[PDB]
Design a protein around this ligand. Structure first.
Ligand code: NA
Ligand code: NA
Lengths: 415, 415
């Protein structure tokens, strides 16, 4: 037979530490407690660009604790925003892991981003227009390339078994975890830091996605705007995030006394090849990503107790994902849509949601999907709502189905 | 034992078609004939930005046949440059492959880029400054994200087993081929289109890399400027490119009557974790990427007849790579540095050089490394020079060691 995690064909891989900054909290355990309490990170946008442009969208979730409140002048001048977020989270994660001394040559970093690794280019032009090519800093190259955040974390932590950056829009953070798992199971690494980072809420992303009719404009009730799978959903809401996890072989964790939080069992990556932004309505390739993760894990659909949905709250997105979940045989799973409370953070969100899936398995509880008040007949999923559902969750799939038809599914198990 | 291509642990994977556009020609076979004839694609830059800024660097290789000479108004308004290059090359490759009808669900696309997938953001701002958020096109989102080129090719050709975009600066195109090989050998796909694309030579990249002292300023003799491994080298020269190859299982090629050009045997990805732009002087992690490709291939260093060097012509870059080649045990290999003739094209160059490595194995010939006139005692490599070297090349490694310490080595075999 082909290798699987269950049959021992792949080494056992465990999640041993997690970190995230969100619109609810800089502390992942406090984010988690808040989600369980029904808290939302989504508020009225107070930014002056809203009134300047009279934007249709006037809501979103800025980080509770801004990254740059932790950043000095040097970091502010010599790193992009996503590089600063990466440095911050990388250091926080390493400290949560008990600052372990690992073999640099068996240590990988894989960190996705979505849009915002395209920040520092304009400023370079400006320097050049005023004073010419010699007024462009010799530091420009290290700030402008889209792999900058992963590069910073790899250099910070000393990762010499590969430093990688996948870009697949919304699924970038999940895809990063996927590739880190592959790096380990193929024998290239024993430990990896992986996840995703993304820039802050800004005017142009709001305008670009608003003009696709992708975004909620329920401005009078910000905390009620994001309604994944609900009959009355009207698009997504931006909520800032960055998230990283530490994964390693079970043997590597045991050798250093690390307590695993969960198992990372398999990962499926597929594509729709359907449309440049819209998901395929039939959910067939998305569902196949789910199935692929199960194959690699050595699980059957009936094993899947829980799906952490991509669940953006767009009309067409949630409908496609319901079809996907059915195609994969997982439509009896308990479903959570964290974007209901945390909003959408393109390249970071899949990583954040992967962290949340780990916590669900660890604690045996799924927070309520906020705003889920009227089930949609065309969805027909068991969506957790009202208050947290405590349950015997043994296995879970985290879905991330990004703009462009990039489908990533990650299979996790309780440790 | 652990799986290898030689021991049958991984399926046999073959290269069945190739395409590229370069500073020498739009036709890869004509590029190849030109390289063998000692031709250089590097000339005086005639662009007005040179004189406007009085740039220190006044040389480079624009594509012989500009992409946009093949592009109509619709494509010009609705795709970024790298997306247009991708569409062009994707279609050319598919036609060279005999336009095969493959199973979409076993067909992957992996396409890297370096910088230039960050083109269309400024124009979106401008539209918004003048007429507001509703003047930003609903097409903006599909043009601004760094995965846009891979997305276009996947949609064009119908690839539903994953559409991926690695970013690792100079090694992006090689890394893409690496991940495509993994996608196949792990069982996720049977066929993949892979490689890299990059934008055109522009003022800001020139200024940014010039200010690092990374670039040659031998403006009076443009064709003589790029001197990899030569004692008198003074940095790299930009030469535009994009390149794609079609790879598939040997069984898949045989079933459809495709004639393989070469075997893709293994791929190693490591990282220096040393510095944000400079390579580690000791070449140890770079060499390890080479070694890893051999392990996966099931080859020993003594099997390696040929190394297609990363060879940028920077003082510190070439020195580090010589150390790498020694560390990997491949310092008896015949070495070629195509950047001598084709220049450096960040995200595309590794893919282009992977194509060149395939042709070397197919034809049993290595073109001369241009400008290699005075060996450097600290390099001590067998560098092909003067005229093509005809040889019994059975196995070859293509090196791509990008800014940030991203090391990719690909192991190829003669078919
Ligand atoms: Na999810
Ligand atoms: Na090379």
């Amino acid at each position: 037979s082909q290798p699987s995690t269950a049959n021992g064909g792949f080494p056992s891989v465990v999640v041993t530490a997690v970190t995230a900054t969100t619109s609810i909290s800089p502390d992942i355990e406090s984010t988690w407690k808040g989600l369980l309490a029904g808290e939302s990170g989504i508020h009225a946008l107070e930014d002056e660009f809203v009134t300047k442009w009279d934007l249709a969208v006037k809501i979103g979730g800025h980080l509770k604790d801004p990254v740059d409140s932790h950043m000095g002048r040097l970091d502010m001048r010599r790193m992009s925003y996503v590089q600063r977020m990466g440095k911050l989270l990388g250091g926080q994660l390493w400290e949560s892991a008990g600052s372990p001394e690992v073999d640099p040559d068996r240590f990988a970093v894989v960190v996705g981003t979505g849009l915002g690794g395209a920040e520092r280019i304009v400023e370079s032009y400006d320097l050049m227009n005023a004073g010419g090519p010699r007024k462009v800093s010799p530091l420009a190259v290290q700030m402008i390339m889209p792999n900058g955040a992963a590069a910073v974390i790899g250099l910070q932590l000393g990762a010499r078994a590969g430093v990688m950056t996948p870009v697949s829009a919304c699924s970038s953070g999940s895809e990063a975890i996927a590739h880190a798992w592959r790096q380990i199971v193929m024998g290239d690494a024993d430990v990896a830091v992986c996840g995703g980072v993304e820039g802050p809420i800004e005017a142009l992303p709001i305008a670009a996605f608003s003009m696709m009719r992708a975004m909620s404009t329920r401005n009078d009730e910000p905390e009620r705007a994001s309604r994944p799978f609900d009959k009355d959903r009207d698009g997504f809401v931006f909520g800032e995030a960055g998230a990283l996890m530490l994964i390693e072989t079970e043997e590597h964790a045991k050798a250093r006394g690390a307590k695993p939080l969960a198992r990372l069992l398999g990962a499926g990556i597929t594509s729709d090849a359907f449309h440049m932004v819209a998901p395929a309505a039939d959910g067939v390739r998305a569902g196949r990503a789910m199935t692929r993760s199960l194959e690699l894990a050595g699980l059957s659909p009936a094993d899947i107790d829980h799906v952490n949905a991509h669940g953006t709250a767009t009309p067409i997105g949630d409908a496609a994902e319901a079809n996907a979940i059915r195609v994969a045989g997982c439509d009896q799973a308990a479903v959570y849509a964290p974007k209901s409370a945390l909003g959408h953070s393109i390249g970071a969100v899949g990583a954040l949601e992967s962290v949340l899936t780990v916590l669900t398995l660890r604690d045996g509880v799924i927070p309520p999907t906020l705003n889920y008040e009227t089930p949609d007949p065309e969805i027909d999923l068991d969506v957790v709502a009202g208050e947290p559902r405590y349950g015997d969750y043994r296995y879970a799939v985290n879905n991330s189905f990004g703009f462009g038809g990039h489908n990533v599914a990650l299979a996790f198990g309780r440790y």
